[PDB]
Design an enzyme around this catalytic site. Structure first.
Site, mmCIF file in Angstrom:
data_model
loop_
_atom_site.group_PDB
_atom_site.id
_atom_site.type_symbol
_atom_site.label_atom_id
_atom_site.label_comp_id
_atom_site.label_asym_id
_atom_site.label_seq_id
_atom_site.Cartn_x
_atom_site.Cartn_y
_atom_site.Cartn_z
ATOM 1 N N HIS A 176 -22.078 63.576 224.321
ATOM 2 C CA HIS A 176 -22.792 63.546 225.746
ATOM 3 C C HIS A 176 -24.135 63.650 225.712
ATOM 4 O O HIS A 176 -24.676 63.689 226.813
ATOM 5 C CB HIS A 176 -22.061 63.988 226.890
ATOM 6 N N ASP A 209 -13.050 91.103 186.088
ATOM 7 C CA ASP A 209 -12.120 90.668 184.800
ATOM 8 C C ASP A 209 -12.893 90.249 183.750
ATOM 9 O O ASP A 209 -13.153 88.997 183.409
ATOM 10 C CB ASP A 209 -11.205 89.569 185.331
ATOM 11 N N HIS A 217 -9.974 88.835 180.514
ATOM 12 C CA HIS A 217 -9.696 87.221 180.284
ATOM 13 C C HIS A 217 -10.475 86.755 179.495
ATOM 14 O O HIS A 217 -10.085 85.394 178.924
ATOM 15 C CB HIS A 217 -9.491 86.667 181.722
ATOM 16 N N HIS A 228 -11.325 81.744 177.879
ATOM 17 C CA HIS A 228 -12.388 81.032 177.502
ATOM 18 C C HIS A 228 -12.643 80.729 176.234
ATOM 19 O O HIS A 228 -13.700 80.429 175.705
ATOM 20 C CB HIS A 228 -13.711 81.575 178.305
ATOM 21 N N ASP A 243 -10.537 78.296 183.917
ATOM 22 C CA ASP A 243 -9.811 79.333 184.816
ATOM 23 C C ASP A 243 -9.014 78.400 185.756
ATOM 24 O O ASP A 243 -8.193 79.224 186.376
ATOM 25 C CB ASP A 243 -10.950 79.961 185.492
HETATM 26 C C1 LIG Z 1 -18.378 87.752 181.605
HETATM 27 C C2 LIG Z 1 -18.784 86.615 181.444
HETATM 28 C C3 LIG Z 1 -17.922 85.655 182.331
HETATM 29 C C4 LIG Z 1 -17.265 85.834 183.094
HETATM 30 C C5 LIG Z 1 -17.084 87.166 183.619
HETATM 31 C C6 LIG Z 1 -17.643 88.360 182.753
HETATM 32 C C7 LIG Z 1 -15.991 87.547 184.683
HETATM 33 C C8 LIG Z 1 -15.909 86.015 185.294
HETATM 34 C C9 LIG Z 1 -16.634 85.058 184.262
HETATM 35 S S1 FES Z 2 -22.505 66.901 224.798
HETATM 36 FE FE1 FES Z 2 -20.249 66.965 225.368
HETATM 37 S S2 FES Z 2 -19.293 67.749 223.745
HETATM 38 FE FE2 FES Z 2 -21.362 67.783 223.119
HETATM 39 FE FE LIG Z 3 -13.083 82.722 183.690
#
Ligand SMILES: c1ccc2c(c1)CCC2
Ligand code: FES
Ligand SMILES: [Fe+3]
Ligand SMILES: c1ccc2c(c1)CCC2
Ligand SMILES: c1ccc2c(c1)CCC2
Ligand code: FES
Ligand code: FES
Ligand SMILES: [Fe+3]
Ligand SMILES: [Fe+3]
EC number: 1.14.12.12
Lengths: 446, 192, 192, 446, 192, 446
Positions: free
Chosen positions: A104, A205, A208, A213, A362
């Site tokens: 509107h 982490d 992992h 990786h 991942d």
């Molecule tokens: C070192 C290098 C990569 C990553 C981490 C640590 C955690 C997430 C991905």
């Molecule tokens: S002006 Fe009516 S919904 Fe935004």
């Molecule tokens: Fe990772």
């Protein structure tokens, strides 16, 4: 489920019920106790530097307009018209003095005020109280060295206090480097994981990396590449882990300034970081200058993560218990040569963007761990985060926070989930504080 | 095309149109079709080394962008309009190929299944570089894995191809402006 | 292709590639395109008897498999790798055609709607059998029924075609390795 | 909904509330009271014959790894890593001595034990109790002539007792034929039906065949083909129906050894079955030898079905109230010539597989009957299963179980749903037994 | 095709088949492919004025129908079998084009993204009108907007094309019988 | 949520909680208190004129078969077989004396009766009571000048009384014009909006037209085209708004007989409407003859809308809180020349059909306003409908109902939502009546 009583995270953060990654009722509860309560990443100064510049951002499942005001401040508002509730802004970024609703035609200022209503005199006469019809404003908007966060809860601690012990680790790169810029626009991809799955991965982490990786480490030649296929454990003293009262935490991998960047950027980066470190020694001391050029994998609670030096910056935007929209930006140091900034930004996307080959490693981990949380026989099962428990310290003379003096462990999982449980079982900030008055003691038991 | 009249058309798109509306050579369109069909076949069977050897030039730029959504009337906001999902030279493509082939790439077991559909092929020689071939084509790319994961990608590809070693025509530039802003396919880990 | 180097490539896929990379005949690719486009048209309008009469050879093997998901490194487990979603001779196809045309096939009222998209056509004559034509093509098959049911199928087809009655080229083998392990289309009751 | 009190199935199994096919809360309740409690089909000896052979299978919505042990036994485990909950195995079948998680590299044995943890000495020291970190094991795994079933509930009756009166009917084909093999891999297709829709159809629905499958009967020339379009009712004495205490049941169509197989296999099969029958007369008696070569449409409660002689073997894997993943295997007799086994397996898939033209006839029936259970005006409506009620017997001198001495009726629906209701309203096996102490009397009323 | 035998085939579809099975001209199929690929390119870049100028004849009928679902055996119920999603003359197309280009068409900001895939091209000259070209083709049309909205359309197009101003072949009729009865794409606001 | 107590619509209908457009629990509650209780559009005489003619229609989420009986009446039945619950009819329209289920072949008459059961004598004997097995019948089916509505609640007011004060406005076009025909088949498209979003828009939203439809107004040249981009406010006396006890309402735009039709139909229509008006002056008076040729944007509560003169006829069929299936028919005057009827029908679809360029203007408005109702920070926010409040009248000497004597306002929103709230908080018609005994007083306050 009674969130006051249910033990979703066991004492000391040692385990979590697998259902936390799959339960939709808990997801809805998190909208209230996590996302409406805590600080959430919005944008960077570098993306809205001029008056009238705006972006849209998610805060939980809500969408906000984040706008640079004429006075240099930033204000954020729900992207919802105050009339019949239509979405006001349909783009991701721009520059405007206001926003007109396409339904509107109501016109709102960059300051959220209802400025004009079509044919107001003939239709409403003097009866429309526009002063009370401004866009619903985000109560708290604060900056950490250009990085802008928002919070819907007026009762929240200031952003700096909320970062707690994590701030000390972030400051060398975020402040003492001369400042960072965020390079946009972000990559955006939906994954079928709970937001907590990548949040926990980035917060703590390192375990992992060598296995998950393996292929990216082997193929890219990055400096952490000796880890590929768990071929080599990092030496003692290779790094540490930390966590904090309000849930933020990170790993520190000493000296890893080129991070995940393929061999093509390694010599340039290691030279640049080392050169700045030498200057910073004299200003902030050797340890903090070293932290500047050390790889930090950090989550700013609840759902903003980053890899400093690698330059990866993430928002894990929640959609439902098994759906998350991943935003990926690059961070660069302002005083880097422009050509280096450009190549660094491309490399961040190459490794961790929508087609990031590291990030792709991942996917199945995050997605299946999340989806298994819905499975009947797994809902009440215990996810383990006990690695390094009983070796953490608090109040160290050199490294602040709850700290594990080892590169690989689950210290930061424990602090993340301790804070998570304290929020889920609390009705407000005062109750979180009461539930957290012995936070570090709980984390350093045994 | 007059982009002052055709208000929705970008200068770039108008330039690319003109390239093909001019000299039509049927033989070139056929050569281009064969080239792209063979490329797609190599990719579909995951012969990534063969694709690099036979289809990709040493000077390649392989680029896929994601453009930020901006107002059609926007004229003040001047910051980076797009990011690079891909922006690869030959060595960077080789890294990605080694990553695919690594026996510890856990995500590739069980083996992925790819099916590519290439349509709307157009070809024109460059006006200034008589050895530079412009090829435009559209792709639907279907990726299936792990029983019930299915991801379908859609894109237009602006390519330049040039004769390299042995007189073989090879890709020296691919540009894709990916049409979906937020990916709903888990990732964009496919070679468009 | 060297499959010792291109680790992800199967011996079968490598063999099929070689077939087309060799003698390219543009005229054959065009004949193949016409053949498949006409086949798809007959199927789309549900002229199943006409399809059998005009497109399908009496010695046909019409086969679609579903392959069990196995580890990329698997070398010990030796049991049946695939099942046959289709593995039909001419009479078996005729049974399926009669089933489609039967007025008590309740599922066919209201009438189904089919739309087929055939791409990536390649053709090569067999080296040893000068009358055997190898054709490869990809198909997207869209089936719509009952207001809001929509099923889309994607596949690569390895065909052999041979001249039969009246000199008409007809299908003597179709092989499809269906790329999705768990079907999300209610069934595979379509002729790929 | 109060499952202790709600009458979802009326007395004697005469009707069921239509909501049972659509209600998601009840589906979630079934995960507990049906799928976590009862015996579910896993695999066959013929699919994992050697030490180290494994397959994945669903049990309800959970996924398990089913592995042949070195000692010749089979054990099954949740396909979920005991660390952070990632899915361990991503393939459907193989051979391995163990399973390594792709997240942090934990290594589990084929026996479910946690055997190795990367860098355990340096990271966990002696603190990780691997003995307590084995994969979550399926409590009960038993075989019925090579067919392997699992049950999460240690309190369940042995599989043989659970089959109850149905076992007598299955034995001629499953045991006395010399044994069956399961031919894999299965076809897998998702249908938009409740798992109970095909389960009830296979357990006791001969009525639908002539009408539903009119086109397949007319087109294929199979031996049941006189039924096409309800052109002819089977003669009296053409067959019978049975059901049992724990819900399993079947129809018996006398002599129908070639089943749904098109005319191309009829002469070969009718010769083979007749020849074996003549031998079995002397071993198990005329009646049971005849049952061997008679077509049995059976459901082993809750969600495993089969057509003996036709050789169709089905698992109706539950996804949600209107979604089921259908697995289709072929069963063959071990002593059949290999070429016949091959053609029989193809014919099973031709008729009842992913492109099974018979199975396709059932799609709309199953899907719409299920989806209508969500519709407001139908939720509280009564699905009827009263055909043949008041003519069933128990304790017959020749045919055991609750038996309807007619080829077409709803006897087996009644027993299936009686058992279903007893489970849904019970908290454990003891309560099911108490609720079932007059099971046959209830079914034979009037 | 004998539609008494091929029970599922409509008289209309049988008529359209016959048109292409007869005189095959390879050159015409190639011209038709170019014509449709260029049309699709103009539409994809949203050069709607250029599309009207270069592709659309002044006497055009541009029609897309949605047919009511009826029993295959129905023979008594005689009321309107279909409605017109589109049934446009040139001026009506021009209205739609102006609507697309209007700066207050709010739905077009941020700019839409279109990608078209044209396949199965067949072409035949009319028997009676030597200047009337029949072209059949299938289209997959992908429309992406607003971050995560994705709509995919599938259709067969029965076209007539005729030489107009400057000898340029232009569309004088397009007929599409849309295969999905209930649209799951928010609307059909695309030019098929 | 306690629907007896929760204020979803504030006093006088001045505002509504945004959650009403997104809350799935409320959607399920609406199935009971809105859709199972109120009159819903089925079909028109012109679509089922002969004995045996039938169509399928939705009533809420239920599907019904609507059939012309031999005696000239119309009866409607759930499209669900009384045996095992399969959907009986899979087509949208046809002619038949009955419907046979494709599962087990039960045959139902056009009158809903169970007429035949295959092999009834041999299978059921005399035991099947077919008299009690007729299709579940829609209790109430009534006509308003050929337009056929159904209601599941036997307690509902007659359709004419239910239309209340709206009937007076509809009668000149629906009755005095000589009668209307509905031109089928309808367009059918799913939108991601709550059914209330288009319902509220059609009932009372003239404010949006100039802005929302700026491009369509500018491009099409229709007679309301001076409104484009809010370039011009309609003069005083350009129209009015009305609403009624049971929720139906409409806007009246004086003289706008060519409606949204592009300039190509304007002269023909304005001549035809003016000519009939001159005749009607003598029969129904000048005012009502003028109303005949005036553009009415109307919603017949809850989910049937129309634009008279434009000839647009809509059903907003509910699927879930953010999904609606839109059916679009054309209405024409019976005595119009056939060629004009044909062109008018095409023009209705051109403007408001599946590819309606006007209707497309509304998509984002309807969809985002609906989807925002799920967003956490918006659920408890107030949608405003206060325009014109305090200027409405009741019991006017000329124009009946609660009436706003201005072309643009929110009068009809207020009456729609007042009725909606009264139904949602009531268990039956008697309670709605009690909750509505001061309906007009509430709407005309201040
Ligand atoms: C070192 C290098 C990569 C990553 C981490 C640590 C955690 C997430 C991905
Ligand atoms: S002006 Fe009516 S919904 Fe935004
Ligand atoms: Fe990772
Ligand atoms: C005989 C033959 C086929 C079938 C049955 C009985 C029940 C399911 C399908
Ligand atoms: C006048 C003209 C068009 C419309 C209205 C009023 C409300 C819905 C669309
Ligand atoms: S989740 Fe399996 S090793 Fe960590
Ligand atoms: S479900 Fe209709 S006859 Fe059985
Ligand atoms: Fe069946
Ligand atoms: Fe509108």
């Amino acid at each position: 489920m009674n969130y006051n009583n249910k033990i979703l995270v066991s004492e000391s953060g040692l385990s979590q019920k697998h259902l936390i990654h799959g339960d939709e009722e808990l997801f809805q509860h998190e909208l209230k106790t996590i996302f409406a309560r805590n600080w959430l990443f919005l944008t960077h100064d570098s993306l809205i530097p001029a008056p009238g510049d705006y972006v849209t951002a998610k805060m939980g499942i809500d969408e906000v307009i984040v706008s640079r005001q004429n006075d240099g401040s930033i204000r954020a508002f729900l992207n919802v018209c105050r009339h019949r509730g239509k979405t006001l802004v349909s783009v991701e970024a721009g520059n405007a003095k206001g926003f007109v609703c396409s339904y509107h035609g109501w016109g709102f200022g960059s300051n959220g005020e209802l400025q004009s209503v079509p044919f107001e005199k003939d239709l409403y006469g003097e009866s429309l109280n526009k002063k009370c019809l401004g866009l619903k404003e985000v109560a708290r908007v604060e900056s950490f060295h250009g990085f802008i966060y928002g919070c819907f809860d007026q009762e929240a601690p200031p952003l700096m206090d909320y970062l707690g012990d994590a701030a000390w680790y972030l400051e060398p790169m975020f402040k003492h480097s001369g400042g960072l810029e965020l390079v946009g626009p972000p990559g955006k991809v939906v994954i079928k994981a709970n937001w907590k799955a990548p949040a926990e991965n980035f917060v703590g982490d390192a375990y992992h990396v060598g296995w998950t990786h393996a292929s990216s480490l082997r193929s890219g030649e990055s400096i952490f590449s000796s880890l590929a296929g768990n071929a080599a454990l990092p030496p003692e003293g290779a790094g540490l882990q930390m966590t904090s009262k309000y849930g933020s935490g990170m790993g520190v991998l000493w000296d890893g300034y080129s991070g995940v960047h393929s061999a093509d950027l390694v010599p340039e980066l290691m030279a640049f970081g080392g050169a700045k470190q030498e200057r910073l020694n004299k200003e902030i001391g050797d340890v903090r200058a070293r932290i500047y050029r050390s790889h930090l994998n950090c989550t700013v609670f609840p759902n903003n993560s980053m890899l400093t030096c690698s330059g990866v910056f993430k928002v894990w935007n929640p959609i439902d218990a098994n759906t998350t929209e991943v935003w990926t930006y690059a961070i660069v140091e302002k005083d880097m040569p422009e050509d280096l900034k450009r190549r660094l930004a491309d490399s961040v996307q190459r490794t961790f963007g929508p087609a990031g080959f590291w990030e792709s490693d991942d996917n199945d981990n995050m997605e299946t761990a999340s989806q298994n949380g819905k499975k009947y026989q797994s809902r009440d099962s215990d996810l383990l985060s006990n690695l390094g428990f009983g070796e953490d310290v608090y109040g160290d003379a050199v490294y602040p926070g709850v700290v594990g003096k080892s590169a690989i462990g689950e210290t930061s999982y424990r602090g993340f989930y301790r804070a998570y449980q304290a929020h889920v079982s609390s009705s407000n900030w005062a109750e979180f504080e009461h539930a957290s008055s012995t936070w570090h003691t709980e984390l350093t038991k045994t | 095309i007059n982009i002052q009249e055709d208000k929705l058309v970008s200068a770039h798109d108008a330039e690319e149109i003109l390239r093909f509306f001019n000299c039509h050579d049927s033989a070139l369109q056929q050569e281009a079709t064969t080239l792209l069909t063979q490329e797609a076949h190599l990719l579909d069977i995951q012969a990534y080394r063969a694709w690099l050897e036979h289809c990709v030039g040493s000077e390649v730029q392989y680029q896929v962008i994601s453009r930020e959504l901006r107002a059609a009337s926007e004229r003040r906001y001047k910051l980076n309009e797009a990011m690079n999902v891909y922006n690869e030279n030959f060595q960077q493509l080789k890294v990605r190929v080694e990553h695919q082939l690594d026996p510890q790439n856990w995500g590739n077991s069980p083996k992925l299944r790819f099916t590519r559909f290439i349509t709307n092929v157009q070809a024109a020689m460059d006006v200034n570089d008589k050895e530079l071939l412009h090829i435009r084509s559209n792709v639907i790319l279907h990726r299936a894995r792990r029983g019930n994961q299915v991801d379908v990608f859609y894109a237009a590809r602006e390519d330049k191809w040039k004769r390299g070693e042995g007189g073989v025509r090879k890709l020296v530039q691919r540009f894709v402006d990916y049409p979906e802003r937020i990916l709903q396919t888990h990732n964009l880990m496919v070679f468009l």
